[PDB]
Every structure is written in C-alpha cells, then in structure tokens.
C-alpha cells in the first residue's frame, strides 16, 4: 500500500508544497511530504512556500505555512512509498538521482489527462490560481485511489 507520499517538482516552493498540503488534507490517513529536484542548486533549501502560493491555498482553506523547501535525494526517496511529480520530464531527472525509485514514481496529474502542471514561479496570481486548480483537481482524483 501507498502510505507515505512524496510530491516532487523543481524548487519545492510553489507546486510541490501546494500539492503536498492539498493531498494531505484529502488523505489524513497518509503522510505527505514534498521535495525539489533542483532546490539546492536554486539556493532555495529552507525557504518557505512562495507567498502567492500560500495565499491562493489559504483562500481554499489549505494551509501551506511552515513549509521548508528540501532537496530530492536517493535517501529521501527510500522513505516514501509513492512519488508524484508535477511534470512528466521530472521522472527522468528524478531517476538520475534515484534510479531505484522509477517503479514508484507517477504523475501528479495522471487522472486529469496525464497533464503536466506548469510552474507559476515569478508570474502573476493568475498563474498561481491556474496551478492550484490543476493541483486540486488532480489531488481529488488521487485521493479516491490511495
């Protein structure tokens, strides 16, 4: 069974913390965390979720406060049963870091047409609203299957 879920993207400040907390609210019987493939190179480790990501989630009663961006590592992947990436291209970048994690890595937006969810970083609130919408729809579908 998939009990520990890791939501993965690039910076671990916008989509992946949002997906973590949206999914955590829908799946209180699971442990959900998140990480970024390039959090360290982006100089983001320890940073909170983007303020606009927090605000958009808060308007939907999802708490993205007290987040700290962390880097995706092979050791981290071993702690989770299921990994959900925001873009299909993230899978190959992830398996470069943790080739053993291929089998448990799936797409966050699998159930909404296997769609990528684009990064809203450094764009207007509209982009964060769009990202939240896709994350919400995608997470609702995952919650019924885990």
Q: CA-to-CA distance for 70 and 63, rounded, in angstroms? A: 18
Q: How many helical (H) and strand (E) elements, i.e. helices and strands, does the chain have?
A: 5, 4
Method: X-ray
Closest CA to 119 of 23, 41, 18: 18
Integer-rounded Cα radius of gyration of the chain: 14
Contacts of 67 (CB under 8 A, 6+ apart): 13, 17, 20, 21, 34, 48, 49
The alpha-helical segments, DSSP class H, found in the chain are: 15-26, 51-58, 74-77, 90-97, 125-143
Contact 6, 33 (CB under 8 A): yes
Within 13 A of 32's CA, how many CA atoms are on the CB side? Answer: 25
10 Å Cβ neighbour count for 73? Answer: 13
Token pair, residue 138, equals: 């995608």
Instruction: Indicate the helix (H) or strand (E) that contains 33.
Output: strand 31-36
């Amino acid at each position: 069974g998939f009990n520990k879920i890791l939501v993965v993207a690039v910076g671990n400040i916008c989509r992946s913390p949002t997906g973590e907390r949206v999914l955590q609210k829908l799946l209180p019987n699971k442990t959900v965390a998140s990480a970024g493939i390039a959090a360290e190179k982006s100089r983001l480790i320890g940073k909170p979720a983007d303020a606009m990501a927090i605000e958009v989630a808060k308007e939907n009663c999802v708490d993205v406060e007290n987040h700290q961006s962390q880097q995706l590592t092979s050791a981290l992947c071993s702690q989770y049963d299921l990994i959900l990436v925001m873009e299909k291209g993230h899978m190959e970048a992830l398996t470069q870091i943790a080739p053993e994690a291929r089998g448990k890595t799936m797409l966050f937006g699998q159930w909404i047409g296997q769609k990528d969810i684009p990064d809203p970083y450094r764009q207007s609130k509209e982009a964060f609203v769009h990202a939240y919408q896709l994350i919400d729809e995608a997470a609702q579908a995952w919650a019924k299957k885990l």
